[PDB]
Write a protein that binds this ligand. Structure first.
Ligand code: KM6
Ligand code: KM6
Lengths: 301, 301
């Protein structure tokens, strides 16, 4: 038994992490097939960051100005293009370690593993969730630029996130592997602020179900409630409004434990109105919102 | 910035995970050079688990009874021996992916990354700490047997843990890579119970220092205290007694933040006597004990 915050094995993504340098900017790149994907911040200097014209900054760049270094193997750039906020550097050698991959744009609430890299070398791996305000709460220092977020399902590596910025809030914002930012964030040192970070309600319910499977069952109540009356309490405590699609996905969890979803919603309603009274659920004194219903069934199979 | 529960990149360990089967038992093995390390539980049946004679159970086994399968590549067993509670199966092919490795026996308080495997295939990776009672709090289902714990320092993979059992407490017990269990645990379905799980005091202090670096500084108090008077409160709340070796290791952390170690001990003393008053430190409502002083400086460099 046991239940932990678990990240996918990062081996298949390590073999794709490289080091990209252009001018004075050096960051991490993603080497898939014969293309190296990196944030377009690589072509910018610390002065033109309040409002950079990335188009004009790229017209003065050419293939020989981009330095891609895989470990120590240096790749020959034979092309370059700017797709939204990422740069696609066509190299001469295809990565012999390129896995089965796809580019996914996840929805707010889904999770992914982040392989933090510095100058092309992997440093650590941790699990993150796309918050409702399209931000993430991770660990990114100077040089973590180009670090990717991914899910590995069976044999396909579904890349979904590439790290770009850290907001003044300490939270992090990034793009999909096609260059489009998650949320209303631009790659400029302008006045950017994330909205209300609500709580992913369906993920908390899945985490409560994982607690029943691992022993902690004290929060199980003798009440029940309706979907509208629970969304009443959910809105007052700034929780995501629960939908019927959310109830349907929690079906398998409600079937193994034999606890209806709405009976679990009443337990969450009591936990939001009365707190935990100094107790813990799965070793935490807070309500966990980074486990999707799939994350629980994966770790409980 | 940011600070997360981070695990080492598991790529170098994935290339060493294999599947071992003997008789009816199938578990995971560690393929380093031309030897496959696996728990000796592999030679046992579900009846002789109250008190198995592993010696006699092995005299009826031979090299052809052990089935090692790396992915689908099957290895030829040319030797076998029992070192304490692990089995060393000499194979014919050396692993082409064998990294720089060493066998380490860690001390209570140190951390390591666990690569959870099922039937030789990696499933997830998470960080664990060797609790003071020589147990760990991880996630191990049926088939996680032989899963290893490791630290990767620079280029050397320091294997330190191999998973064996789950106690009735839900906690987990295992051995070093030489077969010796951590603590007074035997590989028998006998009456086994872990002792008092105290709190690693020096790790909590390092985590409080990481909070000051990442913004959360409300717990910083205007008091101070002595080492003996803090150990007074530490013992009452079942904390590990703080030593001067502990104070010396936190030196670098006290130098960057400009906060003396004993001034931080007074803040922890107030947090143990008055709680958190509904607040959070680094996003947690509890006191975190799985970050060593090295884990903080690694994630803050
Ligand atoms: C790493 N990669 N991109 C960045 C970045 C982009 C825009 C701004 Cl305003 C700051 C940092 O950092
Ligand atoms: C996996 N590997 N070893 C074991 C085990 C050993 C002893 C006992 Cl009593 C239970 C399980 O599981």
């Amino acid at each position: 038994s046991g239940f932990r915050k678990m990240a996918f094995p990062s081996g298949k993504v390590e073999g794709c992490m490289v080091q990209v340098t252009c001018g004075t900017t050096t960051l991490n790149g993603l080497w898939l097939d014969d293309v190296v994907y990196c944030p377009r911040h690589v072509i910018c200097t610390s002065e033109d960051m309040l409002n950079p014209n990335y188009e004009d900054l790229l017209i003065r760049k050419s293939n020989h100005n981009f330095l891609v270094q895989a470990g120590n193997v240096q790749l020959r750039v034979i092309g370059h293009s700017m797709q939204n906020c990422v740069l696609k550097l066509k190299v001469d050698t295809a990565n012999p370690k390129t896995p089965k991959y796809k580019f996914v744009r996840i929805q707010p609430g889904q999770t992914f593993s982040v392989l933090a890299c510095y100058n092309g070398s992997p440093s650590g791996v941790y699990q993150c969730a796309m918050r409702p305000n399209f931000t993430i709460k991770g660990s990114f220092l100077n040089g973590s630029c180009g670090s990717v977020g991914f899910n590995i399902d069976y044999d396909c590596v579904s890349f979904c996130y590439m790290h770009h910025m850290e907001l003044p809030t300490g939270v992090h914002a990034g793009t999909d592997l096609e260059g489009n930012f998650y949320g209303p964030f631009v790659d400029r040192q302008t006045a950017q602020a994330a909205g209300t970070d609500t709580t992913i309600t369906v993920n908390v319910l899945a985490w409560l179900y994982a607690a029943v499977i691992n022993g902690d069952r004290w929060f199980l109540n003798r009440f029940t409630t309706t979907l509208n009356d629970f969304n009443l309490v959910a809105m007052k405590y700034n929780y995501e409004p629960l939908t019927q699609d959310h109830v349907d996905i929690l079906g398998p969890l409600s079937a193994q434990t034999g606890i209806a979803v709405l009976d679990m919603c009443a337990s969450l309603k009591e936990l939001l109105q009365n707190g935990m009274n100094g107790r813990t659920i799965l070793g935490s004194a807070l309500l966990e919102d980074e486990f999707t219903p799939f994350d629980v069934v994966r770790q409980c199979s």
